[PDB]
Write a protein that binds this ligand. Structure first.
Ligand SMILES: O=C(O)c1ccnc(C(=O)O)c1
Ligand SMILES: O=C(O)c1ccnc(C(=O)O)c1
Ligand code: NI
Ligand code: NI
Lengths: 459, 457
């Protein structure tokens, strides 16, 4: 009933700013490790174990009972949602029968030594949803999760490394973990998940420990890990994942094709003809040419690549990544106050089976419903506000969702995005006319994107 | 019978090297302008007029009589091969009926004021083919052509600029041309053809002249041009086109995705995470941010972009472009000596209705059939020799054609490509066995890619 997790969620309900709620929840997650230290020295660099000394820390997030219930009450499929795996005599086996994962089947596999992995707990647990939806706001990147249930004296998976930053939350029982430094330069901060390794591919762990409930274990993409239950106790953990494909290189991948295009359009030097005869000295068949033009060609290509930096539309790409992040995000979890001050909590009056709202005025005080639900993006000379409030808890079930923002409302919209959580009077919005102030505010409110200082209707 | 064009083609037939032939033909094309001056100062920079003072200069390349004949004897289609166009009352009209362009239809369109434009004369004229096949070898880029026949007192086309470098060869009659400097910075060396312009979009011509037969007019992509026949005389010209999408930027377009990919794979700095909160200070809503992290973000982008050069597979991209060029190329036109010394000129012996006859030997002296017909390209794990000798005179009618070169033949193949036109003994080829020397030479010969010093039969 009353755990540190339930206490901190009650606290978050009272923090008016979504930004401040995200920072606090992250702070709680790694408490008493300071986030400042964590992000400066440890993140993307070191494996980290937080010994919590509190078995109740995470209670309410997820339990085996929740798993059983979801298998029974929801349409959980093998493969798509749940895997059954064993690592036995040095080999990973997958024992997923096809179709629905009923309790009977899942618990038999478990008694046969199979670990069970739930791929999308947030689609089924509202507590995991809330937890992820808040944390994503301070990562700037989708926050996903997997739940792992491993029976006693067993190992579910071959050693591997992931392509995401991982925070292992130990929920029930105990598990012996071994985590390894990237084995080689190319596996440091790996771009994609590893193959299954054998114990012969591995050195000595940088960290080897038995996790107990309440503990946390963080480690970067590229760090090989494996885990096993010792005698008697089963293991249940939740792994929070973020930062899949969120590298400088991913940023450059979107920028360069646009940069080249802009250069070629804006600067005639990029549009000049290649030499007529460069094929006599460039290409595989000429890799040992002594021709001094070869060196001049190589050097010109290098210098032109570097000059491309000037034409890189860094801002438009930050925005595209912002739009993708909106699209990937979980829908928000509203505080009581947010619900009550928005379209979501607007009560309807009923008289003899029929309904009987109240319009916004220039005196209505407003601000964005939350700080991480919307993004203004220029595309093709139009302006669009993309938002998360209609996203599903299933990853990319819904297509990207936006509304057009007209040029005469652009400054008002920017003010609203930039001034959260401060209230602004609709009559103060810097639009051309009074009708524009009202129309913009009403559009945003009716769509679930704005709250008012006092509700617009009452019981 | 005997024009400067026929004389120069006869001369080319005696120049053993295809490279030299190409340079000599280009020299002839702009004579007496030196190519060295042309390529250093004029190319891609200036409109240029060569007043030849010789009406016969181009005789034999193409004529109205050739057009008539090709309409009658070949399957020339409207749209695909020939357009009938008029510029009248300030508008471009296309009067192309669908289907085949018979003489009757084309000459009626002509008499109603239509210019006739032949999109692919080299598909039908063996002299235009030869001319283009030789010149492409000194451009490093497909050489195309169009033929324009414009009736008297008429204009076929709206003013426009092209996306290729143009050399207008005046073949018959006279035409008043007006050429314009790029109107604006973005139209200098333009990347794609212009819309149809009106006379109101245009300034004063940088060059305005009446071309006569023999004359040449060159002008770069981006230069607006138009032309018209005055009283009495019709006009026939051939425009030679090259250098479509052959820019540094096109080269960089193909290199950047590979460069990023190699950098992210080979160097951990490209694999580090972006900041969690960069969206608070980057993006269009933040172009005026005071935030000093915006400045540090920009600097890191610049430093990472500058380092990308080290991971660019410049040779691999040169090769891809070389393969596209092989694919785009016209098939070669062999000299007499080339034909006779290759598989093409090998006679078959017939006895009582059956064929009867040499193998190459380690003593046979060889070199590539021509210098511009083949290219070694590394792709995936493998090595392939792409070649032009099976290309059609129609652009991309044939898909790209290659044969695999096994790793232990690579050096020999390179020596052959790099040492043309010097004869090498098959026994001198730097392979690892005698059998490899022979197999590589035989494969190349049988494919039409090699000639021998003496015929084999
Ligand atoms: O519990 C495991 O066996 C296991 C294996 C691989 N990965 C994870 C994880 O949380 O990443 C857990
Ligand atoms: O002769 C013409 O009207 C004309 C128009 C556009 N282009 C060309 C050409 O030779 O490019 C010629
Ligand atoms: Ni893992
Ligand atoms: Ni033109």
């Amino acid at each position: 009933w009353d755990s540190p997790l339930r206490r901190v969620l009650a606290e978050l309900n009272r923090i008016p700013s979504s930004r401040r709620r995200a920072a606090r929840l992250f702070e709680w997650l790694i408490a008493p490790m300071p986030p400042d230290h964590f992000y400066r020295r440890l993140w993307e660099r070191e494996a980290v174990l937080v010994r919590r000394q509190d078995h109740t820390y995470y209670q309410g997030l997820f339990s085996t009972a929740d798993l059983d219930s979801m298998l029974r009450n929801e349409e959980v499929q093998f493969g798509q949602h749940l895997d059954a795996a064993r690592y036995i005599n040095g080999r990973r086996e997958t024992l997923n029968p096809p179709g629905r994962a009923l309790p009977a089947a899942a618990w038999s596999l478990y008694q046969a030594g199979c670990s069970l992995r739930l791929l999308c707990p947030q689609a089924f647990s509202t507590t995991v949803w809330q937890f992820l939806a808040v944390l994503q706001e301070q990562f700037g990147s989708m926050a996903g999760s997997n739940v792992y249930l491993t029976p006693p004296n067993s190992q579910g998976f071959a050693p591997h490394y992931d392509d995401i930053e991982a925070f292992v939350l130990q929920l029930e029982g105990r598990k012996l973990w071994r985590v390894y430094r990237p084995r080689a330069p190319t596996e440091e901060l790996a771009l994609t998940s590893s193959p299954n390794f054998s114990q012969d591919d591995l050195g000595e762990p940088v960290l080897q420990t038995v996790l107990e409930p309440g503990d946390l274990l963080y480690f970067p993409r590229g760090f090989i890990h494996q885990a096993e239950c010792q005698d008697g106790v089963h293991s249940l953990h939740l792994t929070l994942s973020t930062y899949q494909r969120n590298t400088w290189g991913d940023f450059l991948e979107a920028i360069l094709p646009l940069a080249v295009q802009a250069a070629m359009e804006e600067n005639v030097e990029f549009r000049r003809g290649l030499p007529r005869d460069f094929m006599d000295y460039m290409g595989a068949q000429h890799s040992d040419s002594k021709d001094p033009r070869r060196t001049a060609f190589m050097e010109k290509v290098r210098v032109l690549v570097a000059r491309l930096g000037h034409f890189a539309p860094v801002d438009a790409v930050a925005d595209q990544r912002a739009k993708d992040f909106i699209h990937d995000s979980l829908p928000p979890v509203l505080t009581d106050r947010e619900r009550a001050l928005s379209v979501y909590g607007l009560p309807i009056r009923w008289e003899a089976g029929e309904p009987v709202g109240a319009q916004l005025t220039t005196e209505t005080e407003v601000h964005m419903l939350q700080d991480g639900i919307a993004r203004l993006v220029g595309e093709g000379g139009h302006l669009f506000l993309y938002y998360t409030v209609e996203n599903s808890r299933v990853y990319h079930l819904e297509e990207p969702k936006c509304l057009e923002i007209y040029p005469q409302q652009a400054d008002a919209m920017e003010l609203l995005l930039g001034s959260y959580p401060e209230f602004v009077r609709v009559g103060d919005l810097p639009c051309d006319s009074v009708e524009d102030q009202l129309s913009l505010a009403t559009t945003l409110y009716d769509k679930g994107l704005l709250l008012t200082k006092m509700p617009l209707a009452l019981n």
